[PDB]
Amino acid sequence: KYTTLSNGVTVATETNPAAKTSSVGLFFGAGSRSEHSHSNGISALTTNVLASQSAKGSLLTAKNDREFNGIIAQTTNDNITEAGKLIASIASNAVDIVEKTDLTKHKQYLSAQASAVEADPKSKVLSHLYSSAFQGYSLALPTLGTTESVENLENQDSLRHLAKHLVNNNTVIAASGNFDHDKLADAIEANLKIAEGVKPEIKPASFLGSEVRMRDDTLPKAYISIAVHGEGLNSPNYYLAKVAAAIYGDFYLHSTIAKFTSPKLASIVQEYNIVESYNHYSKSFSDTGIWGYYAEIADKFTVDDFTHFSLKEWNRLSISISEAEVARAKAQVKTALAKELANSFAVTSDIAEKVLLVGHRQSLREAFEKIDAIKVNDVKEWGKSKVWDRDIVISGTGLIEDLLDYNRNRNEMAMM
């Protein structure tokens, strides 16, 4: 349900009486993708400053996504309207809040988070993968910035960022839970007061096949990630890309089901226990995406074998995927989409993301209907289009001495 208030801001809510808890959040787009190297991380710092304010019994949290930012006030259902007003105030007084703020503590916290994503091997691997894939454009910047640039941020830069991006045309009030939509819209209307402005142009980005290797021999495993230019939220192949990823699905060697998981790659990789774990993903941005897998290999002598087998299984995408695999992938993608949209916080985040980045959010029934329509030939056409003999982007962190050079993995993408 949508209502465009005065000021032109749009309130989008997905209310459902079965919801356990309610949530409402103001998202103003312009994540890290809107920043540049000197002022990177300013969006996350500003959202943290805004979300650090008094909660009045709610739960304020920052979003800090790649392409959009926002503050979400989770709260029990009956309190939702109050939370509404809260966030409205938090954004009507955004410039005042930032001006009166001593950023030292907030910059310390943001640098701590930035180091955290630089220590969690998967976070580091995917951050480096995105940075190298879209290198040369703002999309390559971290969501939370780097520990070098954060310390160089000041209040004035945050004020400039807010003035540019916290505008009516570039903001949305998302909500979910069990409440009357009209009450929330009325409560926000009387309290939301943000400056006028045109939607900032979303900076371009183009995928560049590359490889980055942060080889740290002291780590216990090899954390690699290999991907290709995927599908952004706009593309009609969005759900098709998700299905293609799910055909290979996840895997964890020590999970009980490890010996029984459907994907052929999983059965291939227990014969010599090539890989400890992996997961295929289709990350989707506003107009571009990254489709691939992340993997952690315990045995440092089998990185090449895992990459070889995984890319061979990708080759299988455009030729020999059977109806069983496609049906399984469709069912698993539908279940995953439903899972992602259970928590009211997650539903609010998804509503904000879709409304900001694509303008319209497809209901879950529409997504199910669109996934059900996928035939095996559709998946194979997508595999030919986007996977078969296409440039790859590679990332690795530790014990990747066995990870062969770019040419070997790239040429694995087109052999039968």
């Binding site: 590359s210 980055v212 080889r215 740290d216 002291t218 990185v303």
Partner: protein, 85 residues
Amino acid sequence: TYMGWWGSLGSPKQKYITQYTISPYAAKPLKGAAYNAVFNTFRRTKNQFLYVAIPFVVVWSIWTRARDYNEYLYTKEGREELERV
């Protein structure tokens, strides 16, 4: 041995080094081959010339003196000197 296989080539613990590269299909092949093969090749030849020239000059000077003396010996005016040897 002093060189294992890919997992452990015998390199010391290596850390803090990041390697970047781009796909061959995304990179221009033979960018400055025309300019490089001339200027850089001339630079390399300039650097390595003396080491090949001084030994070559010495050896070829010895060879030239020997050859010229041999030619001189087997001539009507070299007959006496050939006989003395």
